[PDB]
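hey can u run this one w/ AGS bound, need the structure tokens asap thx
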Amino acid sequence: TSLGRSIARSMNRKFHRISLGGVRDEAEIRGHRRTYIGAMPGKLIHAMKQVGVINPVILLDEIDKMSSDWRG
Amino acid sequence: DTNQRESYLREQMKAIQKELGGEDGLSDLEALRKKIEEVGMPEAVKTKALKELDRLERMQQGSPEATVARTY
Amino acid sequence: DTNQRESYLREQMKAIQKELGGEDGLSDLEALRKKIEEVGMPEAVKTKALKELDRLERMQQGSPEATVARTYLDWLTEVPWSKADPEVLDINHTRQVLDEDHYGLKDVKERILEYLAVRQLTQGLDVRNKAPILVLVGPPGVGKTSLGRSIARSMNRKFHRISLGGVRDEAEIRGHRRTYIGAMPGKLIHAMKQVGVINPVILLDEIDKMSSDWRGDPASAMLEVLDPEQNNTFTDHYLDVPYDLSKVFFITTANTLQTIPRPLLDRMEVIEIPGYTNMEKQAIARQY
Amino acid sequence: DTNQRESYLREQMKAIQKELGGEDGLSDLEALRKKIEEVGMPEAVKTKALKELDRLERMQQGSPEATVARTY
Amino acid sequence: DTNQRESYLREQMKAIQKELGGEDGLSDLEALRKKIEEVGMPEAVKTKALKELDRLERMQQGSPEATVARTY
Amino acid sequence: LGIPRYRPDKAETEPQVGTAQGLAWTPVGGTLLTIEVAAVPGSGKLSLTGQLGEVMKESAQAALTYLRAHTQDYGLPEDFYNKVDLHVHVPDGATPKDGPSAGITMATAIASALSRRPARMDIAMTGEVSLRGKVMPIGGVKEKLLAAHQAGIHKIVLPKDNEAQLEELPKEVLEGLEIKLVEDVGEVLEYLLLPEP
Amino acid sequence: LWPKQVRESGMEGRIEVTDAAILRVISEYTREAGVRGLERELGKIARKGAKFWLEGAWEGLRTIDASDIPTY
Ligand SMILES: Nc1ncnc2c1ncn2[C@@H]1O[C@H](COP(=O)(O)OP(=O)(O)OP(O)(O)=S)[C@@H](O)[C@H]1O
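ok here u go:
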């Protein structure tokens, strides 16, 4: 956490440790499927909102035990 | 009667989420038109912002495609 | 009267479709329905395209069909039907191209020149189709993309690569049961989509690492595409009209000469590529 | 008002969708039938051919209800 | 009267599956049911048969409650 | 780069007593199945160790039949075979290439035990043994060759009887090699140990 | 087999074959107790014939000989 905070502030960027490990689908990562109900923002896009620029530093937290409900 | 009272009961849930419900997708509704101009001048993010500009305009609690456009 | 009737029908379904969906499913419905026409289509693909549009126009804002049928329309348009590059049937052009590709075990090259010396001769449509698949066998990391792409640029087609490291189902050689969202075709179809023709060349890598223990057996499903009269009749569970896939040149990297299936150990010529020598690899790096 | 207008416009787009789905799909089940009576089938064989003709008349563009009957 | 009562409700709901809803496999389970009630079986057979008739009348897509029940 | 993940050269890798360079052709890459056997006075029961299957055990007995024909080559008494219980580990004890292409390598591991003297490393062997103790031609010659030279191995052992395949080899490969050719199991096993007894 | 395999690999049969080689082919080049590997060796006849008659032709109308069996 403090590691990545020091990374982005060392690069004068905005660190956002985001919840990607333990997402039920590609739903906080790739966003839930469109044209209908059941969607939430991607945590990558949470961080991309949360940075103000074209060039951030973004954590992808605890990718060791990844699983997803989309067939993919 | 169980099915249709369930339907009208969640319809009153939507209506109280709309008239006296300030905490809804209408909470971020002003932030949307407030921040459409802070989307970037490159075509990649500008085009998707303008295509979500009209897809969002429906009801943010009951309409299916309006919630994914709202969150996106 | 009748042509104004049909014109009003088409324009009104288009208009009220755009007015109520998400700009026709994020502009994508009209994007694909005009991307149908810029691609040359077979007529069954036009009928199926309208069906994909139908399973999409029943709901472009409700059921997963609003997305899966939309992606199905994307698959039909993205894969360019009736589209072939003006390839070049040639031999010494290829000899000099495998000269500019670095040294090589070079035994392989005469098997290649052997095959293509047959592929200039005249029986049939282009050349009569009785040949092995010319299977590459060996390790990873040797030039099974290098000389593969070198042969690709030597005859001027669309190179790509599709590893097959343990596909469990026909559902990744076909599609999954495309009635739900999440159903997607195989990566083979992803590649064939990604190249801008009907008739590219290919590397098929890592077939000996495949695993099949369910009802859908991919080994049968890759008999369904390796055999030449079959890929023009092959269809996904995702797709419904077979793709014009039969005019193909096709090399294949397996990595075991044993665990590959015996109904695919026919029609093959053992191209033994082991590792290179020291000196070969040193100059490979040193000037490429 | 929002739900009734959503449902009624959903109703016409479903109905004229069924119109268009009937308009664009033709001359394939008739190919099945003229393949039935071109084959010198016995009476039990023909009445099972009629059985899977009645197993048609369902949704067919990507649906399992009658497409497997069509291939059958 | 009670067994015939549950049976009258049985062919009523089998009829409901018989006009529409995949036409009950053109009354596929009905042949099993009428063959249950025609051929004179023991009563443990008949009880498990009637409770499997209840266990029937479901989805028919490689499921344990209809296909192996048809075999059964 | 970083710390060298392997040795600088496979020209010297400490030639041990009982290391047998297994020139198999694995699925993913070409490996050196450096299998081991160690000699001990025992009971004669050939120990089926290290995941042996059907043809590996009889290949081992094929080795010991040839050794029993040729005990003087490997420092062996006349009745040593009734008092040795030899143990072995086979990484990929089930065969990757589904063949005893390391058959003479298994024989090498056995005799490299039974000499208690160095079977030299760094020069890697392949081939099938015979009941008459002969090196039978091996399908897929060049794969074993350049598996060895992929591991940088200069000197490769292959059947004499495949001198036929030797000329079809590319003329940019053997220049970094030398392929000493053997028709029987004796001379392959005699070369790859400098102190054969 | 030579009319078969020579006609099936694109070639008209423009170049021809003797039999004092084909006895050496079946004795020295396919030691199977069937005929399929003879068909394979005749495939490689067609292959090397197409090459050495197409990468530069020392003759235009040739015939393969038992003195050049290793050559072919
Ligand atoms: N022998 C070679 N000579 C020249 N370039 C080579 C050679 N081998 C590989 N390359 C180059 O390196 C790329 C890939 O290198 P490789 O290590 O061969 O990876 P790879 O071949 O794709 O792995 P395999 O062997 O195909 S499963 C090729 O696309 C070439 O650009």
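The two ends of chain D are 47 Å apart (CA to CA). anyway lmk if its weird
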